[PDB]
């Protein structure tokens, strides 16, 4: 499912990301735009053979099981495929674990490079929230 910006900001807010670990909603919406284009089915394969999955591009090296990242973990204890659903619940629950891991939103490279330090509230202006 490909969300629009405000649709996804609403959903995200509804699953409790606004100010989660101190990260205001716009951080999350920014991250998702640049990670996945707001597409829940996005998948990308990394150089180590792991893969990133879903609207927040969560990686199999550590967070989910895909059966083809040898040596890896499944800390979210989910198939990676659950991160591809039209319902964002499993991606959000897993994103909450990740952001609580030590490095905050720096886990998301696109966040660091494109969202961190910017006026992220732009991303939720004009949304019904």
Which amino acids are annotated catalytic?
A: 35, 52
The least distance separating Na ion from the CB of residue 79, rounded to whole angstroms, comes to 10
101 belongs to an annotated ligand binding site: yes
Cα–Cα dist 122/54, whole Å? 23
Which single residue brings its beta carbon nearest to Na ion?
A: 72
Q: Does 24 bind Cl ion (CB under 5 A)?
A: yes
Which part of the chain contacts Cl ion (CB under 5 A), choosing from 42-50, 75-83, 88-96, 110-118?
88-96
Q: Binder to Cl ion among 19, 73, 77, 87 (CB under 5 A)?
A: 87
- Alpha-carbon distance of 121 to 11, in angstroms, equals 16
Burial, 112: exposed, middle or buried (Cβ in 10 Å; 0-12, 13-18, 19+)?
middle
* 11 binding Cl ion? (CB under 5 A): yes
Taking the C-alpha atoms of residue 118 and residue 56, their distance in angstroms, rounded to an integer, is: 19
Q: Which residues bind Na ion (CB under 5 A)?
A: 60, 65, 69, 72, 74
User: Which residues does the annotation place in the binding site for substrate?
Assistant: 101
């Amino acid at each position: 499912k490909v969300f629009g910006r405000c649709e996804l900001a609403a959903a995200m807010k509804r699953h409790g990301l606004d100010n989660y670990r101190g990260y205001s909603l716009g951080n999350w919406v920014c991250a998702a735009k640049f990670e996945s284009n707001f597409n829940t089915q996005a998948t990308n394969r990394n150089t180590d053979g792991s893969t990133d999955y879903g609207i927040l591009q969560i990686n199999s090296r550590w967070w989910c099981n895909d059966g083809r990242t040898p040596g890896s973990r499944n800390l979210c204890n989910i198939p990676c495929s659950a991160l591809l659903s039209s319902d964002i619940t499993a991606s959000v629950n897993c994103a909450k674990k990740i952001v609580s891991d030590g490095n905050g939103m720096n886990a998301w490279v696109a966040w660091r490079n494109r969202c961190k330090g910017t006026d992220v509230q732009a991303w939720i202006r004009g949304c019904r929230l």
